[PDB]
Amino acid sequence: MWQQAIGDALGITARNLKKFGDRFPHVSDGSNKYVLNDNTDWTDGFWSGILWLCYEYTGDEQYREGAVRTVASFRERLDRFENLDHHNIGFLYSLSAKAQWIVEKDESARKLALDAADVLMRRWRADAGIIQAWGPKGDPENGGRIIIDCLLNLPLLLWAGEQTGDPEYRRVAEAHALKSRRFLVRGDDSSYHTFYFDPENGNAIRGGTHQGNTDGSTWTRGQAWGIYGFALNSRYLGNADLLETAKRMARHFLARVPEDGVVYWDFEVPQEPSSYRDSSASAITACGLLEIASQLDESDPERQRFIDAAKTTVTALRDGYAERDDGEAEGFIRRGSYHVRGGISPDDYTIWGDYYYLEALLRLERGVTGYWYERGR
Numbered sequence: 001m002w003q004q005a006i007g008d009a010l011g012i013t014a015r016n017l018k019k020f021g022d023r024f025p026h027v028s029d030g031s032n033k034y035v036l037n038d039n040t041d042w043t044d045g046f047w048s049g050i051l052w053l054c055y056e057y058t059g060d061e062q063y064r065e066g067a068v069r070t071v072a073s074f075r076e077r078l079d080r081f082e083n084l085d086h087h088n089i090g091f092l093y094s095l096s097a098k099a100q101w102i103v104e105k106d107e108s109a110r111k112l113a114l115d116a117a118d119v120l121m122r123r124w125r126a127d128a129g130i131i132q133a134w135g136p137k138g139d140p141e142n143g144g145r146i147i148i149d150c151l152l153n154l155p156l157l158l159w160a161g162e163q164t165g166d167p168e169y170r171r172v173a174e175a176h177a178l179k180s181r182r183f184l185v186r187g188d189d190s191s192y193h194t195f196y197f198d199p200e201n202g203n204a205i206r207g208g209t210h211q212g213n214t215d216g217s218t219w220t221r222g223q224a225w226g227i228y229g230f231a232l233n234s235r236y237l238g239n240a241d242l243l244e245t246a247k248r249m250a251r252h253f254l255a256r257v258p259e260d261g262v263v264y265w266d267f268e269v270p271q272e273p274s275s276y277r278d279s280s281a282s283a284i285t286a287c288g289l290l291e292i293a294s295q296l297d298e299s300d301p302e303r304q305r306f307i308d309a310a311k312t313t314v315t316a317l318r319d320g321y322a323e324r325d326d327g328e329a330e331g332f333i334r335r336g337s338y339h340v341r342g343g344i345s346p347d348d349y350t351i352w353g354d355y356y357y358l359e360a361l362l363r364l365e366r367g368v369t370g371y372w373y374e375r376g377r
């Protein structure tokens, strides 16, 4: 059912850890090999997250040892503040530092994650009323810009608050999430990728993207970040509207799933085989669907509908996109897309797609929920 699928991921990760050594996988680029970086992108945490996931599934120290080393790398990355002037602090540290604390209660890890939360919390522009996504403070173009991806960076702040009792975190967390819900989600339940606000007064300027097909289109990964993001924020904040928004976006997504069960990179481009896909968006949604259901009561007949939608998605990814552990392939699922608009890895492995695909599996097979919040929140 789910064991075989997890088995391939397990074997692939085992080979990868040895081959990658201390480096981090990002995306493939025209082949079955991952392009590695020295912990300098926004995705390094997904590697740490996959290693932690494999460790919890097998108990095999080879995975933990690898994950532990990535934690040391993140400590050094924070120390020399390298490529951290971004909102992705959550993506980077929730699945690495925070994960280790969620996994084994490592105090050193905990503090590393809290330290990361601090630097991120400062990304909040009291005026704009939002956590600046990309660029430096007051950038001449991105000072007041929010990307839907940012919702996944909030759990690190929400977690820090509960661990520090400091109300700062939660306040800024909810402010950004409500702000996103109001300006990133559209009236037909679709969503904008990013939204711009005046840095000075904070007024709403417009919604748009440089990644989705058009400013008014629906980039599937963006819709996915919203589905999982809003659901995650609904858990921490006990916010029913955020949960409703998650459900709305989920139904919008599901109604546009193609015949083979995996989505194209954008809902507004030609929905046919010649268009590029984004298996990572389907993977993210599977997790998001399960997160949503977990917040619903059994009497709610929609709960099982989302659980089944999730199962169907994962099975679809497995059957038509998953790689077998053939001793060479380095990715879990094929046909993810980084930047179709730009021709950058438009049909490749994406480390985030792999992580969510694996998180969905461990959630479905073991009930493991990733590292966005303390197990059992």
Ligand SMILES: C[C@@H]1O[C@@H](O[C@@H]2[C@@H](O)[C@H](O)O[C@H](CO)[C@H]2O)[C@H](O)[C@H](O)[C@H]1O[C@@H]1O[C@H](CO)[C@@H](O[C@@H]2OC(C(=O)O)=C[C@H](O)[C@H]2O)[C@H](O)[C@H]1O
Binding pocket: 027, 028, 029, 035, 042, 086, 088, 091, 134, 149, 150, 211, 221, 338, 339, 344, 345
């Ligand atoms: C400079 C960054 O890396 C570039 O590398 C590209 C490489 O991945 C590809 O395989 O080959 C290309 C040609 O050699 C090579 O240029 C990418 O082009 C990348 O776009 C570029 O900037 C990064 O872009 C991402 C996405 O816009 C930024 O934001 C992240 O995006 C996403 C997402 O879902 O795609 C999630 C995160 O929340 C968000 O931060 C990165 O910040 C930026 O570095």
